[PDB]
Amino acid sequence: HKTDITLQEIIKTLNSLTEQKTLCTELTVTDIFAASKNTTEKETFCRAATVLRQFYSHHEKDTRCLGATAQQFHRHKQLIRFLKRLDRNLWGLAGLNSCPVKEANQSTLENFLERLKTIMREKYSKCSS
């Protein structure tokens, strides 16, 4: 709660940098908004962390949309895992401690970005400072 300049950037940053650095594959990724079933402040975030990881691989594995070989596949993997973990741990929103990954749902990564972007974009744009 004390910090904010963290998610504030991650939002606007990734939100603004959509076309820039991003893999073009559009994979079905569970929808976190699917709270109309079973979502808790712990699990909800956990699942979100998993989704963020998948997306994080997009905005951090290609200059624009060319490459994605089996080579870096195992490399950039540690980069995202480390960065994501560090970021997620920097704020500590999930306040959890690592959890299993499950896709109780399915939604094109594109659809997720549209929903996430819409909220996140209208969230930070609130000018908190």
Swiss-Prot record:
Transmembrane segments: none annotated. Disulfide bonds join 3-127, 24-65, 46-99. One of its GO terms (molecular function) is growth factor activity. Glycans are attached at residue 38. It is found in: Secreted. The keyword Cell membrane does not apply. Coiled coil: none annotated. One of its GO terms (biological process) is positive regulation of transcription by RNA polymerase II. GO terms for cellular component: extracellular region; extracellular space. Keywords: B-cell activation, Cytokine, Disulfide bond, Glycoprotein, Growth factor, Secreted, Signal. Changing residue 9 to A: About 500-fold lower interaction with IL4R than WT. Cytokine secreted primarily by mast cells, T-cells, eosinophils, and basophils that plays a role in regulating antibody production, hematopoiesis and inflammation, and the development of effector T-cell responses. Induces the expression of class II MHC molecules on resting B-cells. Enhances both secretion and cell surface expression of IgE and IgG1. Also regulates the expression of the low affinity Fc receptor for IgE (CD23) on both lymphocytes and monocytes. Positively regulates IL31RA expression in macrophages. Belongs to the IL-4/IL-13 family. It is linked to Ischemic stroke: A stroke is an acute neurologic event leading to death of neural tissue of the brain and resulting in loss of motor, sensory and/or cognitive function. Ischemic strokes, resulting from vascular occlusion, is considered to be a highly complex disease consisting of a group of heterogeneous disorders with multiple genetic and environmental risk factors. Interacts with IL4R. Interacts with IL13RA1. This is Interleukin-4. It comes from Homo sapiens (Human). The lineage of its organism: Eukaryota, Metazoa, Chordata, Craniata, Vertebrata. The gene is IL4. The chain holds residues 25 to 153 of 153 of the full protein.
